[PDB]
Amino acid sequence: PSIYGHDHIKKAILLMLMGGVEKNLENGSHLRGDINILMVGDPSTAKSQLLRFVLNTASLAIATTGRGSSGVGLTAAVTTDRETGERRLEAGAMVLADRGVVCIDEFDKMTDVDRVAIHEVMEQQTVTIAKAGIHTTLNARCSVIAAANPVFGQYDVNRDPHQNIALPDSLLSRFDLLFVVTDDINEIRDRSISEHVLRTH
């Protein structure tokens, strides 16, 4: 209730938290069941705050940032057990978030290499690890919400949408909904949001 505006963003969040049913076929393999939402906008437009709210209100979710994560350790890791002395897999960031939702900040600022992990997971909702003699397919049917800022400091309305976003088209095509948010200067809305924020504090 403390976020002014963003009505349809809230509606999309509500539809995402309780998304559609998964369809499986004996011949059609697998059909994706949830919805992913991506947001891009100029700074200070309440994206991280809404993401934190979604994290707090969700039944199961994991917090992740683009710069402070590595794709190899984000899915599965190989470590040795102290008792037995053998090596066994450790679940990654989104494996723990199976059937949950994963929220990522600074999505555009993440290293390009790690992005392939998302390219692996969001494709078929299954991550396959093959390293040091371990062969297993791990299930991960999580939904991913991300927020990234454009290449320039502020969004350019007069420019091509493709050149405003640093991410490649391959991953952008997977996300169902693209939302662009800008803080247009308007004295009426400035007064309204100012009195609202002063009410909050």
Binding site: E187, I188, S194
Partner: protein
């Protein structure tokens, strides 16, 4: 301290964000640098409108005297369309 006033007046500066609403104000009525009549308050100043002003007779309206102004604010420009002065 007046008995009648217990309606409330509003500072000039708080007129910036709203429009199409009537208000009561008071301040130094004088001429700005450009040459128009304006109201000055410890908060700010605005432009006035006189073309449809009905005064309270029996008063010498001279620049430099505090006057109670009633009218509607408009944000198309910065014109406070006055309807009465007392």
């Amino acid at each position: 301290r007046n008995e009648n006033f217990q309606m409330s007046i509003t500072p000039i500066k708080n007129l910036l964000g709203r429009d199409a609403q009537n208000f009561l104000l008071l301040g130094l009525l004088n001429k700005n640098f450009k040459g128009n009549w304006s109201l000055e308050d410890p908060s700010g100043s605005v432009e006035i409108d006189i073309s449809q002003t009905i005064p309270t007779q029996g008063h010498y309206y001279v620049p430099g005297c505090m006057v109670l102004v009633e009218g509607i604010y408009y944000s198309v420009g910065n014109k406070f369309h006055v309807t009465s002065m007392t």
